């Protein structure tokens, strides 16, 4: 609202920084204009964070182990290095799966080499080899092993690639070395890229010569859905109701056989472009599989996505798509009728990772809500290119926002609701502003699809209109 006021706010917030930090952070804050298409000319992204400023960004290990590789349920992922990284990331992300944990699934376990001083001084390749033998003995039903490098692995002269090659050839097992040391890159995004490269080099092509899998013209793969709270399942049900056969989903509730089967599908459905565009483009080049982005957040986006996907196939799929839309119409209409009056007019600010800051705006607009500000930890300029046309005029955009910046922006804009991660939640609850976790769905969800939309609407209503927010001022003061 009131563009000139928003650039004024940007300048006033920036005044506190030293000159180098202020000059840097100025490039990462822009006022939105939906007409603008090339976001490079307004906002800058995917740059190093300013030291000492309390960024929200993670590291490459989080992007690779926490995001891409960890959800693969039937593999064992080794946190190679000291104890901290695997422990802080153990079961912190709700990438749901079906399995018998500790027997044939291992997502919520923490396998680590637990580096000690001697492993730092004399290297850890021999410890790695013994660890792999121990894994094979103690978890015989595992279907492969990944090695997720923490910072010291890259710093010291360890060579996990040769260990992985030798051991994998010795035990006839897929061992995937991942050089996702946390000092690499500037955020989780290079973690995504490194992980995708590991998938391509060590897993994706194992069945290039195998032609025993039976294929159909309706074979699809879901790429970049990590099944947070069951999101991927709630999307898969709609796709299969449309008459498609989902051969694989990457990587939530994913298995290594599904990854290896992906090169046999007819279309790749990319949910998170930011994290899986690398492998999607590779698959298009090497196997000729087309890919498309879709959005199952809220009924309007879901309907548009289903229609476009069905348009990629024959007339029978299109008829089935119209049947699915008709069948679900009363459910999301009832949700809208019940919850839109309680949320109409309310204003939201968001700050999330690489996809959801723009991807969820349609659902808020379906509940009659406005996104007056959004931003990303680690998005790239193409992400902002999509975001600007998604967002409205004179709205605030922030890339790699500092804690101080986001607090000041919120104190000025005064939105009715903030959606962000765990490190901002309690800050804004103390500030008396309703907050929804937009990474973990506040241990709720799923939000994808028609079934997810009802949960989304209920959650936003229950938090935004909660009576607690009216009691922060003691009656005597």
């Amino acid at each position: 609202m009131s563009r000139e006021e928003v650039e004024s706010l940007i300048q006033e917030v920036l005044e506190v920084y030293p000159e180098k930090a202020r000059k840097d952070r100025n490039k990462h804050l822009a006022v939105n204009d939906p007409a603008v298409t090339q976001s490079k000319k307004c906002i800058i992204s995917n740059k190093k964070s300013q030291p000492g400023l309390m960024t929200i960004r993670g590291c490459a290990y989080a992007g690779s182990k926490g995001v891409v590789w960890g959800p693969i349920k039937d593999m064992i992922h080794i946190s190679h290095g000291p104890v901290g990284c695997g422990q802080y990331s153990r079961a912190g992300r709700r990438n749901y799966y079906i399995g018998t944990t500790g027997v044939n699934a291992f997502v919520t376990m923490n396998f680590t080499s637990d580096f000690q001083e001697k492993d730092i001084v004399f290297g850890g390749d021999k410890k790695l080899a013994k660890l792999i033998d121990e894994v094979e003995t103690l978890f015989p039903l595992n279907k492969g092993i990944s090695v997720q490098s923490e910072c010291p692995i890259g710093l010291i002269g360890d060579d996990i690639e040769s260990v992985s090659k030798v051991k994998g050839a010795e035990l006839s097992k897929t061992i995937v070395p991942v050089r996702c040391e946390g000092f690499r890159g500037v955020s989780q995004s290079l973690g995504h890229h490194i992980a995708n490269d590991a998938v391509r080099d060590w897993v994706l092509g194992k069945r290039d010569e195998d032609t025993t899998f039976a294929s159909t013209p309706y074979d699809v793969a879901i790429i970049g859905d990590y099944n947070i709270g069951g999101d991927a399942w709630s999307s898969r049900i709609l796709l299969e109701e449309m008459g498609l056969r989902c051969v694989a989903q990457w990587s939530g509730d994913g298995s290594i056989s599904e990854i290896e089967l992906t090169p046999k599908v007819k279309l790749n459905l990319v949910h998170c472009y930011r994290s899986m565009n690398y492998i999607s483009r590779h698959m298009e080049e090497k196997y000729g599989i087309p890919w498309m982005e879709y959005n199952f957040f809220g009924p309007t986006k879901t309907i548009e996505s289903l229609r476009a996907i069905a348009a990629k196939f024959d007339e029978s799929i299109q008829k089935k798509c119209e049947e699915v839309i008709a069948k679900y119409k009363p459910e999301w209409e009832a949700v809208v009728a019940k919850y839109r009056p309680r949320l109409e007019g309310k204003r939201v600010m968001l700050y999330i990772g690489g996809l959801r800051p723009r991807h969820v705006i349609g659902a808020y607009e379906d509940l009659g809500m406005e996104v007056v500000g959004t931003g990303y930890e680690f998005a790239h300029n193409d992400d902002y290119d999509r975001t600007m046309k998604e967002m409205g005029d004179s709205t605030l955009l922030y890339d790699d926002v500092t804690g101080y910046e986001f607090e000041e922006f919120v104190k000025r804009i005064k939105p009715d609701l903030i959606g962000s991660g765990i490190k901002e939640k309690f800050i804004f609850q103390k500030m008396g502003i309703p907050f929804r976790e937009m990474h973990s769905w506040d241990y709720s969800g799923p939000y994808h699809g028609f079934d997810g939309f009802a949960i989304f609407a209920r959650d936003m209503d229950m938090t935004l209109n909660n009576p607690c927010w009216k009691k922060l001022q003691a009656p005597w003061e």
């Binding site: 506190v16 920084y17 180098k20 930090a21 964070s49 030291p51 000492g52 400023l53 309390m54 960024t55 929200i56 960004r57 993670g58 490459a60 290990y61 000291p82 104890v83 901290g84 695997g86 422990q87 802080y88 990331s89 153990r90 749901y96 944990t101 500790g102 027997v103 044939n104 376990m109 396998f111 637990d114 580096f115 492993d119 103690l138 039903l141 910072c151 000092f183 500037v186 069951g230 399942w233 898969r236 049900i237 056969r245 509730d253 298995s255 056989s257 599904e258 679900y328 949700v335 101080y404 991660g421 765990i422 490190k423 309690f426 103390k430 008396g432 709720s444 799923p446 922060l472 003691a474």
Partner: protein
């Protein structure tokens, strides 16, 4: 599908027939899953004694550890000082993790910064990161002090914190008088408690090492209290209350209770409470220094005895009846303050509660884990209750601590079936609770997966988890509890006896089968 009047979240939404059928189709068609009979057989095997032998032969593989890395402890220590910003020299991913870990345990905002070292610092060092980060942090968050720790990246490349900070001061990035204590906190050594110890020793040295000339032991008539790595706010509170009731002047060094319990009144307070710099400067003038968790306060003890010349008493953690008694008596001897009637009455009330639930507590078998001081205090209290510790696990314990716990166990008949494990993880403990089943587990939220596994074997094999320790992620506001002193002992006793009775009620609920024992009065 959904019903607008009764909306279902993931549970039980995915138990609907359409979702079950879809998941079965996914599994059968594309997952190449091992047959269910194979899965059952392998699980059963993982519950066996032979599997336990293989599991305990592990030398290189760690599974489900029960400890964290040093800088987490360093950050917690730094948080206990007034208007102090924890600053971690190294990579920013570590700080994201530390903040989220503490957020989830405390449900409170946690302030911490990094200087975001990247691949470039791997060849040029992180000196520039330190200069710019100190300047940015001071300018933006306005702290009275910046406490510097390190991630393993910085430790491996050998960044000289002292030189970097001194150069930052000389070159005008931060004022020369601005306090910047530092500590090397290598994550490949020890654990989070070690990081707390290193950070505290760094702060104490920074404030007292160069000004010892005018210091006179006992001149301020106080006792210093060092709590160590403490994640129960009630523990800080109970120590303060007990010392105030005795009329004992004290100085709690590293007190984070205010900053981890700010009210929700419409404003965000980044800092609150905490040990002041004036208290740290005046600490050598105290009568003595008491360490509440000696088994991870060794470096601090060396500094306090060597430099402050305080005769640090040999005291256990004030947990349970006898150790609380000993702590109070030592404090009385040091300060010359008698133990008042209120504390005597509180002690008698704890004894009253013991004499009442003894019949339900007696002989109960427990597996427990956690940090060394907490574990040994819990073991001592359990022996006082007539309970049997069976599996005592401390992943970050050492041989000397293990010997001390063994001596504690040998002093009681109730310790006859106990074994102390050090360097073992929660997968080891899973095997133990399968092959020598205890009645309950006492530990942190990571024990819930062990309870899940034991239930999978069968209801008769299930070992319920009693959540005491750190971190507790799947219950709300338990960080407000107390475990030290008579009050903490009372809370623990209540938790234990009511867990026992709740399990008994569950087992006897079956109508006309086991409810002959579903007594109204217990």
């Amino acid at each position: 599908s959904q019903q607008v009047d009764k909306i279902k979240a993931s549970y039980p939404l995915f138990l609907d027939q359409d979702y079950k059928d879809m998941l079965a189709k996914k599994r059968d068609g594309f997952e190449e899953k091992y047959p269910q009979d194979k899965i059952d057989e392998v699980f059963q095997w993982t519950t066996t004694k032979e599997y336990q032998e293989l599991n305990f032969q592990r030398e290189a593989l760690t599974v489900n550890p029960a400890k964290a890395c040093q800088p987490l402890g360093a950050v917690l220590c730094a948080l206990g000082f007034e208007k102090t910003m924890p600053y971690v020299h190294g990579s920013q991913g570590c700080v994201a993790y530390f903040r989220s870990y503490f957020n989830r345990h405390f449900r409170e905002p946690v302030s911490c910064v990094s200087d975001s070292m990247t691949e470039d610092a791997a060849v040029f060092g992180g000196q520039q990161n330190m200069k710019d980060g100190l300047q940015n942090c001071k300018a933006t968050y306005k702290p009275d002090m910046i406490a510097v720790s390190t991630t393993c990246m910085a430790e491996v490349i050998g960044d000289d914190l002292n030189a970097f900070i001194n150069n930052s001061k000389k070159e005008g990035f931060i004022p020369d008088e601005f306090p910047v204590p530092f500590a090397h906190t290598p994550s490949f050594v020890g654990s989070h408690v070690t990081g707390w110890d290193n950070m505290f020793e760094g702060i104490a040295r920074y404030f007292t090492l160069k000004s010892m000339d005018d210091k006179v032991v006992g001149s301020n008539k106080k006792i210093n209290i060092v709590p160590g790595f403490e994640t129960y706010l009630g523990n800080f509170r109970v120590i303060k209350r007990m010392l105030s009731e005795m009329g004992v002047g004290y100085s709690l060094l590293s007190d984070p209770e205010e900053v981890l319990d700010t009210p929700a009144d419409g404003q965000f307070r980044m800092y609150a409470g905490g040990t002041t710099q004036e208290e740290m400067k005046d600490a050598p003038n105290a009568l003595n220094t008491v360490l509440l968790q000696p088994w991870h306060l060794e470096k601090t003890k060396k500094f306090v005895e060597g430099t402050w010349k305080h005769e640090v008493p040999k005291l256990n953690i004030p947990m349970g009846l006898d150790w609380t008694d000993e702590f109070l008596m030592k404090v009385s001897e040091i300060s010359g303050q008698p133990i008042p009637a209120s504390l005597t009455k509180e002690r008698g009330r704890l004894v009253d509660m013991m004499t009442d639930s003894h019949t339900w507590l007696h002989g109960k078998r427990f597996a427990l884990w956690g940090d060394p001081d907490f574990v040994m205090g819990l073991v001592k209290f359990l022996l006082e209750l007539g309970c049997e510790p069976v599996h005592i696990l401390c992943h970050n314990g050492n041989k000397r601590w293990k010997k001390a716990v063994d001596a504690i166990l040998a002093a009681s008949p109730y310790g006859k079936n106990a074994t102390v494990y050090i360097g073992k993880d929660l997968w080891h403990l899973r095997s133990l609770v399968f092959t020598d089943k205890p009645d309950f587990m006492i530990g942190n939220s990571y024990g819930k997966f062990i309870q899940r596994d034991t239930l999978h074997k069968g209801k008769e094999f299930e070992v319920p988890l009693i959540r005491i320790g750190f971190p507790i992620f799947d219950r709300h506001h338990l960080h407000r509890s107390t475990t030290l002193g008579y009050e903490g002992a009372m809370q623990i006793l209540t938790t234990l006896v009511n867990s026992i009775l709740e399990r008994l009620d569950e087992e006897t609920r079956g109508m006309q089968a086991t409810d002959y024992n579903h007594d109204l009065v217990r």
